[PDB]
Paper text:
OXA-10 (PSE-2) is a class D β-lactamase that was originally described in the late 1970s and confers resistance to cefotaxime and ceftriaxone but not to ceftazidime. Natural and laboratory-selected variants of OXA-10 have been identified, many of which differ in the spectrum of β-lactams that they hydrolyze. Class D β-lactamases share the same general structure with conserved motifs, including an active-site serine 67, a carbamylated lysine (K70), and a stabilizing and invariant tryptophan residue (W154) within the Ω-loop. We were able to determine apo structures for both enzymes but not in complex with ceftazidime. Both protein structures contained two chains in the asymmetric unit, corresponding to a dimer, as previously described for OXA-10 (14, 24).
OXA-935 differs from OXA-10 by two amino acid substitutions: G157D, which it shares with OXA-14, and F153S which is novel. OXA-935 differs from OXA-14 in a single amino acid substitution in the protein’s Ω-loop at position 153. The amino acid change F153S introduced high flexibility into the Ω-loop of OXA-935. In contrast, the Ω-loops of both chains in the crystal structure of OXA-935 had open conformations where the hydrogen bond between K70 and the indole group of W154 was absent (16.4 Å) and both of the K70 residues were decarbamylated. This more open confirmation of the Ω-loop created a larger and more positively charged active site cavity, which may allow it to accommodate bulkier and more negatively charged substrates, such as ceftazidime. The F153S variant found within OXA-935 yielded a distinctly different structure of the Ω-loop, in which W154 was considerably more flexible and oriented away from the active site cavity, the carbamylation of K70 was not observed, and the active site groove was more positively charged. The carbamylation of K70 in other class D β-lactamases is favored at a more basic pH, whereas OXA-935 showed decarbamylated K70 even at a pH of 8.3. Thus, unlike OXA-10, OXA-14, and other related β-lactamases, it is likely that the K70 of OXA-935 remains decarbamylated in vitro, despite increases in pH. In contrast, OXA-935 showed higher affinity (Km = 17 μM) and substrate turnover (kcat = 0.24 s−1) for ceftazidime than did OXA-14. Therefore, OXA-935, despite having a more flexible Ω-loop and decarbamylated K70, hydrolyzed ceftazidime more efficiently in vitro than did OXA-14, consistent with the observed ceftazidime resistance phenotype in our P. aeruginosa isolates.
Numbering used by the authors:
A (entry chain B): 19 to 143, 155 to 265
B (entry chain A): 19 to 145, 152 to 265
Write the structure that this text describes.
């Protein structure tokens, strides 16, 4: 029996940074989610680089991504960022959100196959022609964690390992950042931080998004959720 | 036909701490490895908790470990260590080297199948409930075995190999992922010192580094060196940190 609760206590962390956003934290064992804003938790936004998670699974399931050790070689021709100008593994391409690598994977999969898997994954309603909510992100990440997506357990495991961003004796953090851009002062951009924490035998799924009009605010997409999860005693 | 090259430059890291031990570091594959001591690199020692790597793979292959999300429930009966007195995941059991969890896995596997898997994995010298004490494995054999695991070439499903690889993650950074396992036989005596291990691999962008470290240890206070010496060597190589 799935449930969600509104917790005004986290508004502190948003107010202190003057951030308009939402944090959704779900405890797997109790099938209970908590958020600071139910309305925004259900609102759909451009996924930006969070879309690299389903794109990676689809890339492996279709065969476009050969296997776990697939290397995305750089032809030497300049790219939007120097961090993309080199050979990358799946983990490498995911961490730096390498646009050209995932655009190439998407082209080889094709429009029809890409849409077929996104419907099967219930992923929102091609990265720019799609919108997804924080609640939809945690549901999708839980399906991935449980290997319940329409793809082999092996391909789901490859993507889960490639998303590892923090390891401690008591927990493993799997996560993905997203940033659509600054947008305009009228219609701001969106910044995301989504993932899950395997802490002892408990699993916590999280999705954070915020309005962003200045690239200088990007660090807040990790600091606000990190402070909330630290105060919940989930991570350090 | 793998080769091992002696590198007297790391001797400094050992001598300074007055440590008798070996570090083996292989870039890309176990084909060409570097070490501070050719002789000791190939010398076989008891694996201690490093044995929990093949134990976990065999547990999964035999179905004793049902799947990736297996929980090892605590029966409430006091254990040798407080950190083992709770339910544990495969990663949790591996991280605290939970003896009771792995002893039970070994029993369910059976000494029969266990020995057939170890032979098929080329794990240690091929010459019951004392595997971590009876087995003998070299630092070179550890990096060869970890390279097979990494490449999914052991006689096990890709899925079971991937589950164990994820459970061994100990450090994550934007540029690298460290998979490792500690081992400690005990302090032994000055005449017969125990052995301390740190084995694993680093996925550094497109490159992979396999490592195996072991040292004589006759005093508890020296334990930190099993991680600090290899870390300092890999930090100087620009692999981690």
């Amino acid at each position: 029996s799935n449930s969600i609760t509104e917790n005004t206590s986290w508004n502190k962390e948003f107010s202190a940074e003057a951030v308009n956003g939402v944090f959704v934290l779900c405890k797997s064992s109790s099938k209970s989610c908590a958020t600071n804003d139910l309305a925004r938790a259900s609102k759909e936004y451009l996924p930006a680089s969070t879309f690299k998670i389903p794109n990676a699974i689809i890339g492996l399931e279709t065969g476009v991504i050969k296997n776990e050790h697939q290397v995305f070689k750089w032809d030497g021709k300049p790219r939007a960022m120097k961090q993309w100008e080199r050979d990358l593994t799946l983990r490498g391409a995911i961490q730096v959100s390498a646009v050209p690598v995932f655009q190439q994977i998407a082209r080889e999969v094709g429009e029809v196959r890409m849409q077929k898997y996104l419907k099967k994954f219930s992923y929102g309603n091609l990265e720019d022609q799609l919108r997804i909510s924080a609640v939809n992100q945690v549901e999708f990440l839980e399906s991935l964690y449980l290997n319940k997506l329409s793809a082999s357990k092996e391909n789901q495991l490859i993507v889960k390992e490639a998303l590892v961003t923090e390891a401690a004796p008591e927990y493993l953090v799997h996560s993905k950042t997203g940033f659509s851009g600054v947008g305009t002062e009228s219609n701001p951009g969106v910044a995301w931080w989504v993932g899950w924490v395997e802490k002892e035998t408990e699993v916590y799924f999280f999705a954070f998004n915020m309005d962003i009009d200045n690239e200088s605010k990007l660090p807040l997409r990790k600091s606000i959720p990190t402070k909330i999860m630290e105060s919940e005693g989930i991570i350090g």
